[PDB]
């Protein structure tokens with residue numbers, strides 16, 4: 001039993017991290033097979049920050065303007081190309097530590113692990129979610145660009161995020177491993193701001209189901225709600241609307257606990273109205289929204305504590 | 307910027323985990339050099355666990371009674387012995403992925419990373435604190451025994467914890483890697499309860515410093531206090547006493563922020579007496595106590611391995 005923010009074991013990703021330097025700029029790259037992936041903004045100088053013409057800057061680079069270092073080894077770059085906002089450096093050696101891997105673009109609400117790195121070396125691992133406003137609430141310092149987000153479902157590493165920048169409110173933005181930004185952001189230093197963020201309702205509901213599995217019952221009630229009435233209330237607290245898709249996703253947790261999804265929705269409406277009254281749920285005095293239905297089933301027993 | 311509960315990268319430990327089976331029991335072992343470490347309770351039947359005589363159970367066993375699997379490879383056990391509540395299985399092959407390591411016993415208040423494992427496969431990593439009552443608040447299912455906890459210093463892994471059991475309240479108890487329990491626990495199926503727990507004051511202060519570094523400042527005030535005055539308040543709230551060593555350890559953060567420890571102590575006094583008055587700190591409505599001063603400096607400085 002117990003319930004914790006849990007990251008994937010980072011080892012398979014650790015063996016892929018390298019350092020990339022171009023000019024005076026050093027950041028992280030991801031070395032899979034014979035390609036190193038990194039943010040294309042590595043090729044910018046100071047006057048290129050507002051309105052870089054990436055095609056123009058890249059054509060001006062030779063292979064030997066890129067210093068790539070894997071531990072103590074220099075890897076020789078033998079080719080370069082750009083894909084959207086990611087740079088792809090061809091090197092003369094395939095990474096012998098390359099895991100089984102794939103690239104996946106995720107949707108808001110999904111969770112993943114981040115391996116934060118500086119100078120091609122891992123600093124730490126933690127769990128994040130893609131926020132509804134397409135940002136992530138990370139922990140990143142200068143030098144952390146090129147750090148990646150990943151899942152490991154069943155021996156294969158699914159890469160879903162690469163870190164590019166910090167926005168003015170202190171939240172983070174980046175791309176998939178095909179170089180497409182999450183959300184409306186661009187790799188320019190022009191003024192940009194995240195939209196107002198909301199709470200990931202389906203994830204909160206999942207976490208309430210986790211609480212019940214771990215033996216909490218204090219927040220349950222005898223009421224139910226229509227889906228529509230729930231949404232009208234929830235939106236007044238800056239909660240995301242719950243779709244029928246979301247209702248379906250919670251069906252297994254519903255069945256394992258014997259509490260219907262709209263039954264649980266009524267608990268959540270009550271909690272938003274009353275607060276916790278000095279109590280906690282699973283070690284929090286807030287409603288947690290960074291655990292998916294899938295995370296909860298994976299982390300929990302298949303036996304409820306009644 | 308930003309601040310998260312962050313584990314050490316687990317790769318160096320992932321390469322050390324194996325599966326150990328004795329009779330019908332499978333759990334995890336730690337393979338370092340030519341020895342596999344695991345909980346001694348692996349050898350017990352259900353009946354045994356009520357009142358075990360480990361000495362007697364162990365002499366009765368031989369090498370071939372222990373099945374050690376590292377992925378698809380069977381290790382040959384060539385010897386066995388017990389040290390406290392840990393079993394040591396000598397194997398015919400040194401682990402070629404053995405990292406630079408040592409065995410270290412930690413103190414209550416200190417944090418570490420747990421690599422939760424099942425059937426010898428790493429499953430998840432998370433950061434824990436050793437509670438004042440010597441439990442950890444972990445996340446463990448059946449098959450997790452023998453999972454380990456550790457810190458990293460440069461390239462050196464310090465192993466500090468091996469998971470043995472769950473207590474009735476859902477908290478967890480285990481040993482150091484020399485088999486000595488943390489806390490007043492024994493490895494048998496009998497009635498055991500954790501003592502009443504306390505809050506780790508120096509860690510709360512470190513977290514308030516992390517909040518300030520990240521621009522979260524509402525709880526700061528013009529006041530200061532004395533160790534004596536604070537401790538009298540704190541002890542009233544089941545907060546551990548703040549020692550002078552604790553104050554010295556916070557010195558780096560006090561200097562980096564311009565909030566002196568006793569200045570920050572005055573803020574924490576008010577939070578205890580008054581609550582958070584509807585606010586949050588670093589996205590929490592509780593006072594978090596599972597980050598050490600060292601944790602905060604490391605995370606906010608960007609130390610690497």
Ligand SMILES: O=C(NC[C@H]1CCCO1)NC1CCCC1
Pocket residue numbers: 107108109110111132200202240241245292293
């Ligand atoms: O439908 C999903 N995301 C998009 C929604 C969430 C906020 C508004 O739009 N599902 C995610 C949660 C479960 C795993 C992925």
Ligand SMILES: [Cl-]
Pocket residue numbers: 105106107110
């Ligand atoms: Cl997704």
